Amino acid sequence: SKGTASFGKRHTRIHGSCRRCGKHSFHLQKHECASCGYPSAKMRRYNWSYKSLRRRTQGTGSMSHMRKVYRAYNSGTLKANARKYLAK
Amino acid sequence: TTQIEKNNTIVFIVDRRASKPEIRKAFETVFETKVARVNTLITPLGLKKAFIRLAPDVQAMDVASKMGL
Amino acid sequence: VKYAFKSDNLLVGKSRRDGVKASFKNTYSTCRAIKGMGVKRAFAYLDNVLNHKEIVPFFKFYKGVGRHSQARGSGTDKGRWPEKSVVVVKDILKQAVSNAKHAHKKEEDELYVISYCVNRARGRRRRTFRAHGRISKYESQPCHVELIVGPKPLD
Amino acid sequence: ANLRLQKRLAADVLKCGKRRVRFNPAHEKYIEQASSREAIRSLIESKIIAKLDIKGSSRGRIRAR
Amino acid sequence: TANKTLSRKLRLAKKTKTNKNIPRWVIAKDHLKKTWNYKRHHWRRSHLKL
RNA sequence: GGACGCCCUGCGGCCGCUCAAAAGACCUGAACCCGGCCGGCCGCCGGCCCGCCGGCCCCGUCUCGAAACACGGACCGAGGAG
RNA sequence: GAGGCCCGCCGCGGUGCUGACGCGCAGAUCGCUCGUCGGAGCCGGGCAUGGGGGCGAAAGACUCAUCGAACCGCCUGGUAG
RNA sequence: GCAGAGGCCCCGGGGGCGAAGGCGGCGCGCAGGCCCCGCCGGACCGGCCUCUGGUGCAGAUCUCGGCAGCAGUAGCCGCUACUCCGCGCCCCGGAGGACUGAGGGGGAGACGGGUUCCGCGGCGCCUGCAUCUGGCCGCGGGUGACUCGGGCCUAAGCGGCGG
RNA sequence: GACCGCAGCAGGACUCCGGGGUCAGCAGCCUCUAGCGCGGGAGCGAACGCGGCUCAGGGAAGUCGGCAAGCCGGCUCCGUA
RNA sequence: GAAUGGACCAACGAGGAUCCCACUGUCCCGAGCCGCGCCUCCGCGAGCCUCCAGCCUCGGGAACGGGCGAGGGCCGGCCAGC
RNA sequence: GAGACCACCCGGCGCGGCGCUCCUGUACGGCGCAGAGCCCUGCGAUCGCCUGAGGGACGCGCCUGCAGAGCGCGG
């Protein structure tokens, strides 16, 4: 009854999917994400686990805009920058 | 194919974002026909499917043949 | 590479089946019995074991096999009637006899079962659920039976 | 072979349970071919498929007591 | 479950849509040798959304 | 990535083929363990033609003292500590 | 036709056999035998209360097989005559 | 003895005319060890001087991998139950004999699962025996609402609010 | 019958609708409808074990202790410290 | 030893005791029976454990040994029980 | 007659009949001048007679029936 018999009464979802992190970490009663931190505007990151930090970070995704803008800085965005720095 | 023959109905996979008013208007312009009732479902694979019942005066088999159904 | 018998031009006929889903211990015993047996006598004997009219003497894996009357003159008091083994050992015997008769122009009477080699094979592994939330192995013990029929009367 | 679909369909057409559906032993082939409610219905007219009586309990002894 | 939400149903339908084996022609094109998707899930042994 | 012939109800066997080689679902292929054949009668050390005689407790370990009815150690391979 | 009344079904408990099991069907189950069965009753869903805190008809019980201080990561390869 | 570094190896050390390694067997050394020979193997390998170390295992309830005896052993003893014939399978069809016994081994929903649903084929996996069976595997499909529910209202509660 | 317990696990898991006979009964025991023969089968009929059954004469002498078993029981009418 | 409540028990109690009637294998003193396991076969098939091994008596010895000293037994392989 | 499996002791087995004997207690059916009564011309639990009947047998004797001794395996 403390063990297998009470495992039979499990038939609810306490954690749903998170809008920001897409993980089964969004508590549905407390309306907060265990990993994402959502609804907070700052993402929830703790230095005690670097493994969690590695799991969701810059570079674990497309990094689209940043990749293109880093490549552009290496090519011709610095010269365009000089024209607006010269300004009027 | 039976639905075209008996219920004057064409079954069409449509954009999920689309609504029954838009699908009636779209079918009516692209196929140049008249639609009476649209009933739709979102499939277990996530794709909306619309059962387009055509107007009684129109014959669905003629609309289907023109499309290639 | 898979055959263990290296006759020097003895005009033998051979067959082998690999990963045979039958017990290694039961098959070993059935093959051992047909050794030194004329091919025609062996086919009848395997058929008698299938009908439970003759016994396969178990000389190497006998812990749990029961003392039986049909094993009276076998040299052992223990034997059993392996059915899934007899079927397999006969099919390989049938292939071996065809191979010898077709290639070496041999005859069923001329042929005798000169050699055999049944070896252990990797077994399918399933899981038995034990008590107190434990899991244990339920693995098969397959064989690699090789049979060679030969013109020699095993002089 | 499996006449499972035929006995499910026939029970639906004869509005009885699969226990009360009774196929003709002679025609195992004719029924095997049927795969549609309509085909089963044609066989039901042919009396190669029939629903049994509800086999209800006798109430004659009860009436006498 | 029969009373699901479209947003739970659409994330579940992706899994049904992608529980597929590598197309045989893909194995031939890439000389893959390993032909098992390994991301395939069987409803009984699996716990999606867990 | 297995020619051809043969026998298969078939599974599959066989003969061989491609190759320098099967290297055949994979380089080399150990030890443990196992099966066929094939000798032998059984551990170590010493003598001798070699199965007889003579000697011979289970190691590591703490410990006054271990064969200990003290503890750890089924077996084997790799890794394993100034 | 009254009752935190009695017998008794389901239900909800869990007494005894110190029965079975004890490499289980089962990390607590099974069979009988039982306590109660209009009530301080039983049951579902939602919600509230959070770790030296909670909640407790009080047994240091219970808090997801964890409770005389939950669990996870870290400090931490803590220190050991 | 090991693994690397800087040198040397008298026409520029040894190697597909066979490297390392594996397996057996000699020799040499008090021994750590070394050498050679046959076989398997199929591209690398050293002797010596100087140099550097993540440098030698029988033990650690040692780690990880394999795996033995036990052992064809313990077991496959909840839910009364199967039988005959027909391709005859535990499949299906007919005939019997029964069981769950309306708080059902019945018909349906909530939740949780997420395709398990259906038809067709299949047995390689699984179906702790079998299988021609299947919730298994391959292929193709399947959920239609002005009236049902969500959505809407408020409940316990929770969030918002110049601050 | 697909949920949750490592599992196609004698465990749990919320409802709705509820036929006939015997019966006070929705109890027990049989049945219509509906469902359907569960990690298999054959023999044999040892010890012993588990689940039962009966036991002559005695009647708790057994045992820590009547543990276990058995007696008792429905209804009607007397009668009741 | 007197609301660290004292005395008092109607009604209650899966509470803890003593006796009586009734009853019965609780026993004297066990016996017979029925299913199912067991057992044998077909098909499937594990665990735990393990230095090595597996007959004793006595002696000495970590004072209680399978191995050691000295005697006495012993084909070898298995099964149902225990 | 012996048994967990084996082993043992036996071997033209066995089957299913017929007798004997034993068990149980008088079969189904027919008949009746039995039957409390009832109301209609029948019903009726039972009862008596046939009937120490019928049914059963694992025990004993017998065969009026099929049967029954390997061309198995060793040697």
What DSSP letter does each residue of chain C carry, written as one string? -------SS---EEEE-SSBSS-HHHHHHHHHHTTT-BHHHHHHHHHHHHTTSS-EE-SSS-BTBPB-GGGTTTTSSBEE--HHHHHHHHHHHHHHHHHHHHHH---TTT-EEEEEEEEE----EEEEEETTTEEEEEE---EEEEEEEESS---
Is some CB atom of chain B closer than 8 A to the CB atom of E13? yes
The DSSP secondary-structure symbol of B65 reads H
What D31-39 contacts at long range (C-beta under 8 Å, 24+ apart), as own/partner pairs, is D31/D3, D31/D6, D32/D1, D32/D3, D32/D6, D34/D6, D34/D9, D35/D5, D36/D9, D37/D9, D37/D12, D37/D13
CB pair distance less than 8 Å for E9 and B46: yes
Rounded distance in angstroms from the CA atom of residue C61 to the C1' atom of nucleotide F72 = 34
Inter-residue contact D24 to D7 (CB < 8 Å): no
Structure tokens belonging to residue C38:
């004329």
Structure tokens belonging to residue A47:
């230095």
Number of neighbouring beta carbons within 10 Å of residue C103: 11
Q: Is the CB of C118 under 7 A from strand F?
A: yes
Overall resolution, Å: 3.2
A39 cis-preceded (ω within 30 degrees of 0): yes
Q: Is the CB of C108 under 7 A from strand J?
A: no
For nucleotide J80, give the residue with the nearest CA to its C1': C66
Pairing of strands C56-57, C125-130: unpaired
* Touching subunits for chain A (3+ Cβ pairs under 8 A): E
- DSSP, residue by residue, B18-53: --HHHHHHHHHHHS---EEEEEEEE-TTS-EEEEEE
Burial grade of B2 (CB within 10 A; 0-12, 13-18, 19 or more): exposed
Which residues in chain A have Cβ-Cβ distances shorter than 8 Å to E7? Answer: 17
Inter-residue contact B16 to B47 (CB < 8 Å): yes
Structure tokens belonging to residue A61:
């995704």
The DSSP secondary-structure symbol of A25 reads T
Of the candidates C79, D2, E50, the residue with the CA atom closest to the CA atom of residue A13: E50
Method: cryo-EM
Which residues in chain B have Cβ-Cβ distances shorter than 8 Å to E6? Answer: 42
| Integer Cα distance of C99 and C33 in angstroms | 21
Task: Identify the H or E element spanning B10.
Answer: strand B9-14
Task: Identify the H or E element spanning B2.
Answer: helix B2-7
Query: CA of E45 to nearest chain A CA: how many angstroms apart?
Result: 18
| Integer Cα distance of D13 and D11 in angstroms | 6
Q: Which nucleotides of strand F come closer than 7 angstroms to any CB of the protein?
A: 6-8, 10-15, 23-26, 34-37
Inter-residue contact C149 to C96 (CB < 8 Å): yes
Q: Which residues of E8-37 are buried (b: 16+ CB within 10 A; e: fewer)?
A: eeeebbeeeeeeeeeeeeeeeeeeeeeeee
| Integer Cα distance of C58 and C80 in angstroms | 7
